[PDB]
Every structure is written in structure tokens, then in C-alpha cells.
A paper describes a structure:
The aryl hydrocarbon receptor (AHR), a member of the basic helix–loop–helix (bHLH) Per–Arnt–Sim (PAS) family of transcription factors, plays important roles in regulating xenobiotic metabolism, cellular differentiation, stem cell maintenance, as well as immunity. The ligand binding site of AHR has been mapped to its PAS-B domain. Here, we present multiple crystal structures of the Drosophila AHR PAS-B domain, including its apo, ligand-bound, and AHR nuclear translocator (ARNT) PAS-B-bound forms.
We then performed crystallographic studies on purified dAHR PAS-B. Diffraction-qualified crystals were successfully obtained, and the structure was determined at a resolution of 2.6 Å. Next, we compared our dAHR PAS-B structure with the previously reported PAS-B structure of hypoxia-inducible factor-2α (HIF-2α), as the latter is also a bHLH-PAS protein capable of binding ARNT and whose activity can be modulated by synthesized molecules. Although the overall folding was similar, superimposing the two structures gave a root-mean-square deviation (rmsd) of 4.5 Å over 106 equivalent Cα atoms, which indicated comparable differences. The C-termini adopt opposite conformations in the two structures, with dAHR PAS-B folding into a helix (αJ), while HIF-2α presents as a loop. In addition, part of the residues between αE and αD folded into a short helix (αD’) in HIF-2α, while this helix was not observed in dAHR PAS-B. Other minor differences are observed within the αE, βH, αC and αD regions. These observations suggest that dAHR PAS-B has a similar overall fold while adopting some unique features compared to HIF-2α PAS-B. CASTp39 assigns 440 Å3 and 680 Å3 cavity volumes for dAHR PAS-B and mAHR PAS-B, respectively. Combined with the fact that the activation of dAHR is constitutive and ligand-independent, we infer that dAHR PAS-B might be in an intrinsically active conformation.
Numbering used by the authors: 268 to 381
Write the structure that this text describes.
């Protein structure tokens, strides 16, 4: 359903985002090129995304229960992301992420459980 995917480097910087994700967030391709992994992450969620970044690179998978990504209009879009390392050859190559939109009341309910 309203789930979208995005490709990232191992440092979490954006490589690609599907059209559904760009419609939800409101950004064009030129606005997301060479965009850092924490660029649009809410200040209150920097440490949380950072720890899931460490779990991802050490284990190969990670799950972010609820965090905030700033939309182009200024509003905050709560997300629920599942990250995984994709292997080219037999080395970690890039990161694939599967997100899901969350309502404001839903993301704030998960804030105390993440």
C-alpha cells in the first residue's frame, strides 16, 4: 500500500528514491542528489537514526520504529523504515530501505517505545 523504497549508500546518503516516496515527501530528483543520510532527519531523531545506522552496518539489518522526515512544505512526515545491506559481490555495497507513512498520533505513540 502506501509504502515506498529508497536506495542509499552505506553512509546512508541518498542514491535513489521511488516516485511514491517523492510524491509523499514532495521533493524532485535535483533536490535529493548527493543528499546526506541525516539531512532531513528531525533533530530529536538524530541519535535514534544514528544507532540504527550502527546496527545496520554491523548486523546487516535494522528497523526504525518511528522517526520524522521533513517534507518540502515544512511539515514533518513520520516514517517506519526497515533497512538492509545489499551485497554486490560478497561485500556490502548499498542499503535498501522500505518505509511506511505514519500518522502524527501513531508516530508519537511509538516515540516512547523506540
Amino acid at each position: 500500500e502506501n509504502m515506498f523504497k529508497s536506495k542509499h549508500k552505506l553512509d546512508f546518503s541518498l542514491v535513489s528514491m521511488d516516485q511514491r516516496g517523492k510524491h509523499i515527501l514532495g521533493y524532485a530528483d535535483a533536490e535529493l542528489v548527493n543528499m546526506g543520510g541525516y539531512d532531513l532527519v528531525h533533530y530529536d531523531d538524530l541519535a535514534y537514526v544514528a544507532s540504527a545506522h550502527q546496527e545496520l552496518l554491523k548486523t546487516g539489518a535494522s528497523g526504525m520504529i518511528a522517526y520524522r522526515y521533513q517534507k518540502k512544505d515544512g511539515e514533518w512526515q513520520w516514517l517506519q523504515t526497515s533497512s538492509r545491506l545489499v551485497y554486490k559481490n560478497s561485500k556490502p555495497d548499498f542499503v535498501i530501505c522500505t518505509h511506511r507513512q505514519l500518522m502524527d498520533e501513531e508516530g508519537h505513540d511509538l516515540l516512547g517505545k523506540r
